Amino acid sequence: LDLAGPLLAFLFRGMFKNLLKEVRIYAQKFIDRGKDFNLELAIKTRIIS
Amino acid sequence: FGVLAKIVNYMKTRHQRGDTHPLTLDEILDETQHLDIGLKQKQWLMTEALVNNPKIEVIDGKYAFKPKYNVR
Amino acid sequence: TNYKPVANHQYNIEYERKKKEDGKRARADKQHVLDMLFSAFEKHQYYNLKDLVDITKQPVVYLKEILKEIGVQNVKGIHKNTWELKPE
Amino acid sequence: AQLKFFEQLDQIEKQRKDEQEREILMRAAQLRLKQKAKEMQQQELAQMRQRDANLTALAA
Amino acid sequence: TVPKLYRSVIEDVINDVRDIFLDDGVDEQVLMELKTLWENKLMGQVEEEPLNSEDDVSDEEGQELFDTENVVVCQYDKIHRSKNKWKFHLKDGIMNLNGRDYIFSKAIGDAEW
Amino acid sequence: LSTMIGKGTGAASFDEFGNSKYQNRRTMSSSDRAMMNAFKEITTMADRINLPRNIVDRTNNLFKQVYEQKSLKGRANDAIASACLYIACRQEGVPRTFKEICAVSRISKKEIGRCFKLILKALETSVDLITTGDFMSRFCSNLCLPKQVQMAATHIAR
Amino acid sequence: FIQMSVQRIVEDAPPIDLQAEAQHASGEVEEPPRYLLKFEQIYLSKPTHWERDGAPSPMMPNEARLRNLTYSAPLYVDITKTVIKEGEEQLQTQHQKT
Amino acid sequence: MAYQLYRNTTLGNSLQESLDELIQSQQITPQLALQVLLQFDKAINAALAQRVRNRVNFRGSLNTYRFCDNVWTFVLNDVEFREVTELIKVDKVKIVACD
Amino acid sequence: SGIVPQLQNIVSTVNLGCKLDLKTIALRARNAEYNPKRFAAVIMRIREPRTTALIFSSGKMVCTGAKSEEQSRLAARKYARVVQKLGFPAKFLDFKIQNMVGSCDVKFPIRLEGLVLTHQQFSSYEPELFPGLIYRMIKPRIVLLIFVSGKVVLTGAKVRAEIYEAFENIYPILKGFRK
């Protein structure tokens, strides 16, 4: 039986992977330009919540 | 080899003058402020390679008549 | 502490300082630009406009004018239509 | 002068040996070709570097 | 001190020109002769087009022509000016003051216009 | 007035080398795509400082008016969005300092201020002057000061 | 979930590796910098509600029921960022509780 | 084909005069003389960059200035070159700078 | 009112009517500087009028720093004559004063808060960006920087009459908000 914990763990796995993907994309643009991207701006807070 | 394409541009402006006459490489190199040494020999090897594909016509004798269509 | 108020982001100020120190590329004389272009072509036959701009260190409009004077754009199966530094 | 021609022939043998005695070192890990390529690259820098000399002489 | 630096410069120059003297095929005695001679030598106007209405609006241009006075040749890292004063971060260079030569690494200057 | 297509079932949907959905759907116009991207950036910036959704909607309306008015077409989008967010916070009565907006936006404070002036001129509107009491609650809470200390600071400033 | 699975999901994710695409067209002997990000040490705060003023305050469950708020808690992660520019020096800046 | 700053100084002038004497004597070709000058410029630049580790100061007034092709041509008057070890006074100076 | 603004800077543009070589001008002029990487014009300064002029290859020149209209015209003529002495056919064509800047003091502190509250349509007071209040007068197209210390700076004027009229308009308004 899958309770609340395992289900939320599956969802959070997916959403954290998406968050890291978005960080990768946003930082890659700035790295290509040669600017030293800010980590706080890269993180899209809305994804997980 | 780049100086060679520059010589091609020079003879193109020479056509633009309309006073085109049978020439040679030494006078062009002098008027374009360049010397006559073994460098001219290697660039003349390149220039003969050019004479193998001189759509801008550069023949050895009486020459330089580029335009495939040319009357005035 | 997160998202603390800053007048300007550190990376942006570093990038702006670098750009200001470098300055805009100056429009050099036609003769010198042409000579540099011919040497570049001597390296090998085909150049893209972006890297040619990098090599010549000239304004894009001025370089494009000088290149249109002699060079010609060829549509090619390499990736796209690019410039040809051979005048003919 | 005839002796100088012989010395030039010896320098040609020395350049062949150096180019070929290691066109082999590269294989063990075309040297002449690489050197030629390197020489081609400098030409563009040299002149960009060089005509600055002409204007600086005019400036000073 | 400065003469010792000059001798070190002599050594560097000869070492740097040896390879060129070999490249051009010239004999090495040229360098010795060069060093010898170098050392010996050392030791209501409505119609406003006419600008002639004003005269003597310039200064003597012979200073730059003469250049006989003391001369400083160096490299500059930063040069700032704020409406009156010129500020100078001139880096390593050479100075020729009253014939005697001076050597420096960091030069700081403030001048008024 | 559009739709979009998915994978569907597994059969003729994917063809010779996996054609997918015959295509990629390819919808809309720039006069809406740019506005959409600006809306996404506005939501991100607001969530960075936990701004409420009403301020987000006011920012979206301000940005729509500015974007259609087009006096700031030369200014980069993110600067316009940040200035609109600042103006919406000012109009809602909970102002954020220019530095606070710059903390969550890639745009510098100077550019945000210039676009703020330009947006004020384009909208022909105005924002009430900020007072020391506007920032007291947020500053004190972020410093974790007691309520009495916050009241004392507000009274001292006023 | 909160105590173990969130932290394990953060740790299991591979580090982010980023580098420029041969920027500046120079000699390019690994010249483009390498940026490495590694997430660590997730932190959770108590449920908090931020007002229109932006001032954080604890969110009681009944207030969430009455005002149709969502009972949620902030989630913070330590991130370590390393820059390798092939300048013989690597700098590992750490961002705390992002 | 180099920076070419120190040629118009005592050292460069002496080197140029020596090269002129050898050219008059036919001992060296003008191309060789030019090569020697280029090598001297490289060596002198390196030597001043490396073996000089002293900090100097100066003050005064400026009468003229010029800039072109990254070449400053300042012209100062009544300059006082102050150093921790010695102080030098000069009525006029011309500062030529490049980079 | 008993107070008249005094000009602090005047900007005037004049066309020489002939193309110029910026490099030659930089090499031959006395106080001129030319950095094409930084700016596309040539910056020259003359001390006797205490002004600075920018000279462009198109033959148009901008003179700034003059405290008076006569000083501006004389400085522009001097720069044109310097360029002419360098061999160019420089002339003096369509000389015009593009902008004038004036400063003055009202000699009393001002409540900028009340001023912006009363004249919000023309006022702009943002202490975060700039401590001085920006007032955009309409009848004369003048922008006034009003400060709590009482200093007032006027800009955007083409003639001295605009400066004086703008100050005359603003003075009763400021007197209404004396601190």
Coordinates of C-alpha atoms in Angstrom, one line a residue, chain D residues 10-26 30-32 35:
Chain D
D10 CA 73.4 19.9 -45.5
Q11 CA 70.8 22.2 -43.8
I12 CA 68.2 20.7 -46.2
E13 CA 69.2 17.2 -45.1
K14 CA 69.0 18.3 -41.4
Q15 CA 65.5 19.7 -41.8
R16 CA 64.4 16.5 -43.6
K17 CA 65.8 14.4 -40.7
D18 CA 64.2 16.6 -38.0
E19 CA 60.8 16.6 -39.7
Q20 CA 60.9 12.8 -40.4
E21 CA 62.9 11.6 -37.3
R22 CA 59.8 12.7 -35.4
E23 CA 56.9 12.6 -38.1
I24 CA 57.5 9.4 -36.2
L25 CA 57.3 10.7 -32.6
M26 CA 53.7 12.0 -33.5
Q30 CA 53.1 15.3 -40.5
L31 CA 55.4 17.4 -38.3
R32 CA 56.3 19.5 -41.3
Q35 CA 54.8 23.6 -38.7

